[PDB]
Amino acid sequence: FKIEGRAVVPGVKPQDWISAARVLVHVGFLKSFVVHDIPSGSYVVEVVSPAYRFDPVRVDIKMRARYVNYIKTSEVVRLPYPLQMKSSGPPSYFIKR
């Protein structure tokens, strides 16, 4: 089976950072986003980037990704369709004085 996805940034002209993406969960790459030849179950995927942040998504594949919370196994927040991720700016690893 497989996993379709889009992985977008607001205005940052994606192509450049495509050189440093490697989606984990089975590994996939960018173009858009596809992961071939997996089994069916409850898998949590994330879009790795070293200079960006992407919130993970918990697919429970018929495809439905509801939410990752890790506390309450039984929960449904019904995310519509594949892995929209909102590219929440640059993560702040540096700290001021």
């Binding site: 450049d16 495509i18 050189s19 173009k31 596809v34 030849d37």
Partner: peptide, 20 residues
């Protein structure tokens, strides 16, 4: 033999993947 990919050679940008 199963998987086949093509890349671009310029930026690392894949253009198409399939499976056999």
């Amino acid at each position: 033999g199963r998987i086949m990919r093509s890349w671009e050679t310029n930026i690392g940008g894949l253009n198409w993947e399939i499976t056999l």
